[PDB]
Known about the structure:
Two copies of one chain form a homodimer. By secondary structure, chain A is mostly helical. Chain A has a single domain, classed as Up-down Bundle (Histone Acetyltransferase, Chain A), CATH 1.20.920.10. Chain A has helices at about 5-15, 35-40, 45-55, 60-80, 85-100, 100-110. Chains A and B meet through helix 1 and helix 6 of A and helix 1 and helix 6 of B. The structure holds ligand 6B2 (2 copies). One copy of the ligand Cc1cc(=O)n(C)c2cc(N3C(=O)CC[C@H](NS(=O)(=O)CC(C)C)[C@H]3c3ccc(Cl)cc3)ccc12 binds next to helix 4 of chain A. One ligand 6B2 binds next to helix 4 of chain A. Chains A, B: It is found in: Nucleus.
Amino acid sequence: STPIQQLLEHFLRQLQRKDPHGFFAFPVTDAIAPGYSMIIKHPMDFGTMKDKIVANEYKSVTEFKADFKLMCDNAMTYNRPDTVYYKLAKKILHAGFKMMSKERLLALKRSMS
Amino acid sequence: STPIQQLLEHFLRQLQRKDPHGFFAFPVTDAIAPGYSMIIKHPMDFGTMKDKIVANEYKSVTEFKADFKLMCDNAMTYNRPDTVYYKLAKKILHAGFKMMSKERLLALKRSMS
Ligand SMILES: Cc1cc(=O)n(C)c2cc(N3C(=O)CC[C@H](NS(=O)(=O)CC(C)C)[C@H]3c3ccc(Cl)cc3)ccc12
Ligand SMILES: Cc1cc(=O)n(C)c2cc(N3C(=O)CC[C@H](NS(=O)(=O)CC(C)C)[C@H]3c3ccc(Cl)cc3)ccc12
């Protein structure tokens, strides 16, 4: 492993701690969510993101954040706002934006300087 | 845990992997290393470094790197060059210097955007 990979694993672990049921742990299938494939063409989940970190496919935090936002956006797109899935996705979306904001990334940069 | 703590735990883990017998895992006593405290006025070891990470006593990678360097220097000052201790400290020093170089850290900071 590498430093960028460890920081992204950290951010991932912190986000996944907010999903203790594991709603977003693994890909949604049509078996569990009828019509999911019809509505969601760009699927994402925390397991996939973990595999992508391990293969070093994220070249920046911006790239990692985009997949994270995509996962949350898919949950809010397929599910209606009165479901546990939508509500949690909105919450964790906010937490991730705060955790990985410019201001936060700047303080971390200081500690590498 | 914080992002800096996680980064430092990564560097520490990678360096300890190079010391499977734990030569540097805990403080050297004078019973095991006669006269050590006469030669070495600022002891350091991987166990202490871990405790400092946990206690949040590193302001930067520079500070951590300085403890690692101190650990290696102590080994290379006290022990004779034909010893396992000297030779392993030198090997580990070089590996650490490669892993925590300014160049590596600039690259890592670029990826935090
Ligand atoms: C209908 C539906 C939509 C949706 O967007 N998500 C994220 C769901 C997640 C569901 N899951 C749960 O409600 C409980 C956790 C479960 N994840 S898990 O099986 O990997 C077990 C966890 C402890 C690791 C998740 C889920 C996700 C995919 C599938 Cl195929 C089944 C259930 C079920 C339905 C949906
Ligand atoms: C003589 C000597 C000098 C020195 O600089 N070092 C680092 C030493 C390390 C020594 N140790 C070993 O040779 C084997 C490992 C041992 N570390 S450990 O007790 O923590 C075993 C581990 C698997 C948990 C190490 C050592 C370090 C501290 C002490 Cl007090 C005794 C032995 C022994 C002698 C010296």
